[PDB]
Structures are given as C-alpha cells and as structure tokens.
Copies of this chain bind each other. A is one copy, B any other.
C-alpha cells in the first residue's frame, strides 16, 4: 500500500472527521448482522439475535472502538503495516483461526459505514484510496497465515 500524495490527502482529511467513539461499533455490528457466521467468534457478547440486539450491545461498541484504534495505527503506519500488525496477526491467525476472507469483509463494511456517514464527501476516488488501505490491513493481518 503506497498511496500517492493525493490519496493520503483524501484518506487523511476524512479520517480526522470520523467519529471514533461510534463508527467502530457500527462496522462490527454490521459485520455480525450482514455476515452472521462471524457471530460465532462473539457469542460471549451475549444477545445477538436481532439487529437491534446487536447495535445496542455495549460490548459490541466497546470492541468496535478497539478495532478502529488499530485502523488508525495502520493509517499512521502505511510504510510498515506488517511490523505494525505482528501481534494482531499472531492473535487472529494462530490463536483464533479467523479466515482471512473475513478481514476483507470487515474492511468493506468499514467502507460502507464511512460512505454512510460522509455521503457525497465519500467520492469514488476517496473510496478507491480507502480500498487500498483496507486491503493492506487485511493483508498484514493475514501475514501469519502466509
């Protein structure tokens, strides 16, 4: 993930505006709701039977926010997403055994949530730069599978 100056420009102007207490919880609830197999990793969180069960789960919002923290780190560190993600990759691959395809899905529902929140601000070029970041994080995370 190299990112031209205008892409980092696009990525960075938006990211700063992003409600970080919120957007994380929206991505994860939406993951669980839209792709319900992922629920198996989160059954601890309790009641996930309905979409309203899910979005209002305080554990869902608390974990979404951790996740968003990790994205901000990758944004901070595009030139070494690998180094940046070593312990997480180790976690998700070795310990948890998550299929890396679900990293792609998490990234793509994050892009939907950003679109949802920013509307027309979230133009096609801005999306295209975000699809690069998203893919590179998904890849660093799968590194330990690699």
Could you tell me which A residues sit within 8 Å of B by CB distance?
A: 1, 135-136, 139, 146
Contacts and interface: CB of A to CB of B under 8 A. Distances in A.
Contacts of A139: 146
Q: Which 4 A-B pairs have the closest CB atoms?
A: A139-B146, A136-B146, A1-B146, A135-B146
A146 B143 CA distance: 12
Contacts of A1: 146
A39 to B, nearest CB: 26
A145 to B, nearest CB: 8
A90 to B, nearest CB: 15
Nearest to A142: B139
Nearest to A81: B146
A139 B135 CA distance: 14
Contacts of A136: 146
A1 B136 CA distance: 19
Contacts of A146: 1, 135-136, 139
A115 B1 CA distance: 37
Nearest to A145: B135
Contacts of A135: 146
A135 B146 CA distance: 8
A106 to B, nearest CB: 18
A136 B142 CA distance: 12
A97 B139 CA distance: 19
